[PDB]
Structure 1
Amino acid sequence: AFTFAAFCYMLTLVLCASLIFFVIWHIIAFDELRTDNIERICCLLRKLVVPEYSIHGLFCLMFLCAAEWVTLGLNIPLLFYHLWRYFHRPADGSEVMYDAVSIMNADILNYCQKESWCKLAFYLLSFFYYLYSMVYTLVS
Protein backbone atom coordinates (compact mmCIF):
# COMPACT_ATOMS: atom_id res chain seq x y z
CA ALA A 1 0.00 0.00 0.00
CA PHE A 2 1.01 3.63 -0.53
CA THR A 3 2.60 5.17 2.55
CA PHE A 4 4.85 8.07 3.48
CA ALA A 5 8.02 5.99 3.25
CA ALA A 6 6.94 4.63 -0.15
CA PHE A 7 6.53 8.21 -1.38
CA CYS A 8 10.06 9.10 -0.26
CA TYR A 9 11.34 6.35 -2.55
CA MET A 10 9.17 7.53 -5.47
CA LEU A 11 10.48 11.07 -5.02
CA THR A 12 14.13 9.96 -5.26
CA LEU A 13 13.94 7.90 -8.44
CA VAL A 14 12.92 11.13 -10.16
CA LEU A 15 15.74 13.20 -8.66
CA CYS A 16 18.49 10.58 -9.02
CA ALA A 17 17.58 10.56 -12.70
CA SER A 18 18.93 14.11 -12.62
CA LEU A 19 21.91 13.06 -10.50
CA ILE A 20 23.07 10.60 -13.15
CA PHE A 21 22.59 13.38 -15.73
CA PHE A 22 24.93 15.51 -13.63
CA VAL A 23 27.57 12.78 -14.05
CA ILE A 24 27.07 11.81 -17.71
CA TRP A 25 27.54 15.53 -18.33
CA HIS A 26 30.54 15.43 -15.94
CA ILE A 27 32.46 12.74 -17.84
CA ILE A 28 31.96 14.37 -21.25
CA ALA A 29 33.12 17.85 -20.19
CA PHE A 30 36.47 16.51 -18.95
CA ASP A 31 36.80 14.29 -22.02
CA GLU A 32 36.31 17.38 -24.20
CA LEU A 33 38.74 19.21 -21.90
CA ARG A 34 41.62 16.90 -22.85
CA THR A 35 40.89 17.04 -26.59
CA ASP A 36 41.03 20.83 -26.88
CA ASN A 37 39.16 25.38 -23.25
CA ILE A 38 39.87 26.47 -19.69
CA GLU A 39 37.59 29.45 -19.09
CA ARG A 40 34.52 27.77 -20.59
CA ILE A 41 34.98 24.50 -18.64
CA CYS A 42 35.57 26.75 -15.65
CA CYS A 43 32.05 28.15 -15.81
CA LEU A 44 29.99 25.29 -17.28
CA LEU A 45 31.06 22.80 -14.60
CA ARG A 46 30.96 25.30 -11.72
CA LYS A 47 27.22 25.87 -12.14
CA LEU A 48 26.47 22.12 -11.95
CA VAL A 49 27.99 20.97 -8.71
CA VAL A 50 26.03 22.84 -6.00
CA PRO A 51 22.73 21.37 -7.34
CA GLU A 52 24.34 17.94 -6.92
CA TYR A 53 24.87 18.44 -3.17
CA SER A 54 21.53 19.84 -2.08
CA ILE A 55 19.52 17.29 -4.06
CA HIS A 56 21.52 14.69 -2.15
CA GLY A 57 21.18 17.00 0.85
CA LEU A 58 17.43 16.70 0.39
CA PHE A 59 17.71 12.90 0.58
CA CYS A 60 19.54 13.08 3.91
CA LEU A 61 16.69 15.16 5.35
CA MET A 62 13.98 13.18 3.53
CA PHE A 63 14.88 9.67 4.70
CA LEU A 64 15.60 11.08 8.16
CA CYS A 65 11.96 12.16 8.48
CA ALA A 66 10.70 8.96 6.82
CA ALA A 67 12.44 6.77 9.46
CA GLU A 68 14.45 4.82 6.89
CA TRP A 69 17.68 4.37 8.81
CA VAL A 70 19.34 1.88 6.46
CA THR A 71 18.62 4.15 3.47
CA LEU A 72 19.87 7.17 5.41
CA GLY A 73 22.89 5.05 6.34
CA LEU A 74 23.88 4.22 2.76
CA ASN A 75 23.73 7.92 1.87
CA ILE A 76 26.06 8.75 4.78
CA PRO A 77 29.31 7.82 2.90
CA LEU A 78 28.38 10.08 -0.01
CA LEU A 79 27.31 12.82 2.42
CA PHE A 80 30.48 13.15 4.49
CA TYR A 81 32.59 13.10 1.34
CA HIS A 82 30.50 16.05 0.14
CA LEU A 83 31.16 18.05 3.31
CA TRP A 84 34.92 17.58 2.85
CA ARG A 85 34.89 19.01 -0.69
CA TYR A 86 33.20 22.21 0.55
CA PHE A 87 34.27 22.83 4.17
CA HIS A 88 37.94 21.80 4.05
CA ARG A 89 39.01 21.43 0.39
CA PRO A 90 37.04 24.22 -1.31
CA ALA A 91 39.38 25.00 -4.26
CA ASP A 92 39.21 28.65 -3.18
CA GLY A 93 38.15 30.42 -6.38
CA SER A 94 36.83 33.63 -4.68
CA GLU A 95 33.52 32.80 -6.43
CA VAL A 96 31.18 29.75 -6.76
CA MET A 97 34.16 27.65 -5.45
CA TYR A 98 34.80 24.46 -7.49
CA ASP A 99 36.91 23.24 -10.43
CA ALA A 100 37.50 26.63 -12.08
CA VAL A 101 40.32 28.41 -10.19
CA SER A 102 43.11 26.30 -11.69
CA ILE A 103 42.51 23.58 -14.24
CA MET A 104 45.61 22.23 -15.94
CA ASN A 105 47.71 21.38 -12.89
CA ALA A 106 47.54 17.76 -14.19
CA ASP A 107 47.12 16.21 -10.73
CA ILE A 108 43.51 17.31 -10.18
CA LEU A 109 42.65 15.91 -13.64
CA ASN A 110 43.40 12.41 -12.37
CA TYR A 111 41.38 13.04 -9.20
CA CYS A 112 38.31 14.36 -11.04
CA GLN A 113 38.30 11.47 -13.51
CA LYS A 114 38.44 8.94 -10.67
CA GLU A 115 35.60 10.89 -9.04
CA SER A 116 33.60 11.05 -12.28
CA TRP A 117 33.40 7.25 -12.47
CA CYS A 118 32.95 6.86 -8.71
CA LYS A 119 29.84 9.06 -8.77
CA LEU A 120 28.29 7.13 -11.67
CA ALA A 121 28.99 3.82 -9.92
CA PHE A 122 27.24 5.11 -6.79
CA TYR A 123 24.25 6.72 -8.52
CA LEU A 124 23.46 3.80 -10.83
CA LEU A 125 23.45 1.55 -7.77
CA SER A 126 21.38 4.14 -5.89
CA PHE A 127 18.81 4.17 -8.71
CA PHE A 128 18.19 0.42 -8.37
CA TYR A 129 18.41 0.49 -4.57
CA TYR A 130 15.71 3.16 -4.51
CA LEU A 131 13.67 1.27 -7.13
CA TYR A 132 13.82 -1.91 -5.04
CA SER A 133 12.71 -0.39 -1.74
CA MET A 134 10.00 1.51 -3.59
CA VAL A 135 8.59 -1.81 -4.84
CA TYR A 136 9.39 -3.39 -1.46
CA THR A 137 7.35 -0.89 0.57
CA LEU A 138 4.52 -0.85 -1.99
CA VAL A 139 4.06 -4.63 -1.97
CA SER A 140 4.65 -5.05 1.77
Structure 2
Amino acid sequence: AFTFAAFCYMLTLVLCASLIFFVIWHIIAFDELRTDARERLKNIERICCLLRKLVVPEYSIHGLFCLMFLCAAEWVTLGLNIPLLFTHLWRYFHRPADGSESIMNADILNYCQKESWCKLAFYLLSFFYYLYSMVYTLVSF
Protein backbone atom coordinates (compact mmCIF):
# COMPACT_ATOMS: atom_id res chain seq x y z
CA ALA A 1 0.00 0.00 0.00
CA PHE A 2 2.68 2.45 -1.03
CA THR A 3 1.33 5.98 -0.74
CA PHE A 4 2.65 9.52 -0.97
CA ALA A 5 2.20 10.02 2.77
CA ALA A 6 4.19 6.84 3.41
CA PHE A 7 7.03 8.00 1.17
CA CYS A 8 7.12 11.35 2.95
CA TYR A 9 7.30 9.39 6.20
CA MET A 10 10.36 7.42 5.04
CA LEU A 11 12.09 10.51 3.70
CA THR A 12 11.49 12.31 7.00
CA LEU A 13 12.90 9.23 8.72
CA VAL A 14 16.12 9.53 6.71
CA LEU A 15 16.50 13.27 7.27
CA CYS A 16 15.76 13.08 10.99
CA ALA A 17 19.11 11.38 11.66
CA SER A 18 20.82 14.50 10.32
CA LEU A 19 18.41 16.68 12.26
CA ILE A 20 19.50 14.84 15.42
CA PHE A 21 23.22 15.02 14.65
CA PHE A 22 22.96 18.80 14.38
CA VAL A 23 21.61 19.14 17.91
CA ILE A 24 24.15 16.65 19.28
CA TRP A 25 26.96 18.76 17.82
CA HIS A 26 25.30 21.84 19.30
CA ILE A 27 25.30 20.19 22.73
CA ILE A 28 28.97 19.25 22.42
CA ALA A 29 29.85 22.76 21.25
CA PHE A 30 28.09 24.35 24.22
CA ASP A 31 29.85 22.03 26.65
CA GLU A 32 33.25 22.71 25.09
CA LEU A 33 32.53 26.45 25.17
CA ARG A 34 31.25 26.89 28.74
CA THR A 35 34.20 25.15 30.43
CA ASP A 36 36.86 27.86 30.23
CA ALA A 37 44.51 35.51 26.09
CA ARG A 38 43.81 36.12 22.41
CA GLU A 39 43.73 32.36 21.85
CA ARG A 40 40.56 32.17 23.96
CA LEU A 41 39.00 34.90 21.82
CA LYS A 42 39.93 33.02 18.65
CA ASN A 43 38.46 29.78 20.03
CA ILE A 44 35.18 31.39 21.05
CA GLU A 45 34.95 33.20 17.70
CA ARG A 46 35.46 29.91 15.85
CA ILE A 47 32.75 28.22 17.93
CA CYS A 48 30.36 31.12 17.34
CA CYS A 49 30.96 31.04 13.58
CA LEU A 50 30.45 27.26 13.52
CA LEU A 51 27.15 27.62 15.37
CA ARG A 52 25.98 30.42 13.08
CA LYS A 53 26.64 28.28 10.01
CA LEU A 54 25.02 25.23 11.64
CA VAL A 55 21.82 27.05 12.66
CA VAL A 56 20.25 27.50 9.23
CA PRO A 57 20.14 23.89 7.91
CA GLU A 58 18.52 22.76 11.16
CA TYR A 59 15.66 25.17 10.40
CA SER A 60 15.42 24.67 6.63
CA ILE A 61 15.15 20.89 6.98
CA HIS A 62 12.32 21.21 9.48
CA GLY A 63 10.70 23.59 7.03
CA LEU A 64 10.88 20.73 4.55
CA PHE A 65 9.24 18.36 7.01
CA CYS A 66 6.28 20.64 7.64
CA LEU A 67 5.99 21.49 3.93
CA MET A 68 6.00 17.82 2.94
CA PHE A 69 3.29 17.05 5.48
CA LEU A 70 1.18 20.00 4.32
CA CYS A 71 1.48 18.95 0.69
CA ALA A 72 0.81 15.29 1.55
CA ALA A 73 -2.20 15.96 3.83
CA GLU A 74 -1.12 14.57 7.20
CA TRP A 75 -2.56 17.07 9.67
CA VAL A 76 -2.15 15.08 12.90
CA THR A 77 1.64 15.31 12.37
CA LEU A 78 1.76 18.81 10.91
CA GLY A 79 0.05 19.97 14.09
CA LEU A 80 2.85 18.43 16.12
CA ASN A 81 5.50 20.07 13.94
CA ILE A 82 3.99 23.58 13.87
CA PRO A 83 5.08 24.68 17.39
CA LEU A 84 8.74 23.97 16.68
CA LEU A 85 8.52 25.78 13.35
CA PHE A 86 7.19 28.83 15.17
CA THR A 87 9.95 28.72 17.79
CA HIS A 88 12.46 28.22 14.99
CA LEU A 89 11.13 31.48 13.50
CA TRP A 90 12.89 33.46 16.26
CA ARG A 91 9.65 34.02 18.17
CA TYR A 92 11.45 33.99 21.52
CA PHE A 93 14.70 35.15 19.91
CA HIS A 94 15.43 38.84 20.43
CA ARG A 95 17.18 41.20 17.99
CA PRO A 96 20.68 41.75 19.37
CA ALA A 97 23.10 39.96 17.02
CA ASP A 98 22.67 37.71 14.00
CA GLY A 99 24.63 34.88 15.62
CA SER A 100 23.72 33.19 18.89
CA GLU A 101 26.33 35.36 20.64
CA SER A 102 30.51 39.19 23.27
CA ILE A 103 31.20 35.85 24.92
CA MET A 104 27.66 35.70 26.35
CA ASN A 105 28.87 33.38 29.13
CA ALA A 106 25.86 34.12 31.31
CA ASP A 107 22.31 32.89 31.90
CA ILE A 108 21.90 33.00 28.11
CA LEU A 109 24.36 30.10 27.96
CA ASN A 110 22.25 28.08 30.38
CA TYR A 111 19.11 28.96 28.42
CA CYS A 112 20.63 27.74 25.16
CA GLN A 113 21.88 24.59 26.91
CA LYS A 114 18.40 23.83 28.23
CA GLU A 115 16.66 24.54 24.93
CA SER A 116 19.21 22.41 23.07
CA TRP A 117 18.52 19.47 25.37
CA CYS A 118 14.79 20.01 24.89
CA LYS A 119 15.25 20.14 21.12
CA LEU A 120 17.19 16.87 21.14
CA ALA A 121 14.45 15.18 23.15
CA PHE A 122 11.80 16.48 20.75
CA TYR A 123 13.81 15.35 17.72
CA LEU A 124 14.26 11.81 19.00
CA LEU A 125 10.59 11.52 19.98
CA SER A 126 9.52 12.75 16.56
CA PHE A 127 11.94 10.31 14.95
CA PHE A 128 10.36 7.34 16.69
CA TYR A 129 6.89 8.62 15.82
CA TYR A 130 7.89 8.89 12.16
CA LEU A 131 9.25 5.34 12.20
CA TYR A 132 6.00 4.07 13.72
CA SER A 133 3.88 5.96 11.19
CA MET A 134 5.95 4.59 8.30
CA VAL A 135 5.64 1.01 9.53
CA TYR A 136 1.92 1.44 10.15
CA THR A 137 1.22 2.84 6.69
CA LEU A 138 3.26 0.24 4.81
CA VAL A 139 2.69 -2.99 6.75
CA SER A 140 -1.07 -2.35 6.87
CA PHE A 141 -1.16 -3.61 3.26
TM-score under structure 2 length normalisation: 0.86
In terms of mean alpha carbon deviation, does 81-90 or 62-71 score higher?
Answer: 81-90
Change in 2 beyond 3 A, CA 1:2/1:21: same
* CA-CA distance at 1:2 after TM superposition: 1.1
Measure, in 2, the Cα distance between the counterparts of 1:85 and 1:38.
Answer: 26
Measure, in 2, the Cα distance between the counterparts of 1:88 and 1:34.
Answer: 22
In structure 2, runs of 5+ residues without a counterpart are 37-42
Measure, in 2, the Cα distance between the counterparts of 1:21 and 1:12.
Answer: 14
- Over the aligned positions, Cα root-mean-square deviation in angstroms equals 2.2
In structure 1, runs of 5+ residues without a counterpart are 96-101
Change in 2 beyond 3 A, CA 1:29/1:88: closer
Q: Deviations along 1:54-77, whole A, 9 cap, x unmatched?
A: 100001110001100001010011
TM-score under structure 1 length normalisation: 0.87
* CA-CA distance at 1:107 after TM superposition: 1.9
* CA-CA distance at 1:86 after TM superposition: 8.6
Greater Rg, structure 1 or structure 2? 2
Aligned position for 1:98? none
Kindly, what percent of the aligned residue pairs are identical?
A: 99
Q: Deviations along 1:46-98, whole A, 9 cap, x unmatched?
A: 11010000100001110001100001010011111111259854634599xxx
Confirm or deny: 8 A CA contact 2:26 2:116 kept in the other structure.
yes
* CA-CA distance at 1:119 after TM superposition: 0.7
* CA-CA distance at 1:42 after TM superposition: 1.1
* CA-CA distance at 1:108 after TM superposition: 1.0
Measure, in 2, the Cα distance between the counterparts of 1:134 and 1:12.
Answer: 10
Measure, in 1, the Cα distance between the counterparts of 2:139 and 2:113.
Answer: 40
List structure 1 runs of 4+ shifted beyond 2 angstroms.
84-95, 102-105
Measure, in 2, the Cα distance between the counterparts of 1:18 and 1:94.
Answer: 21
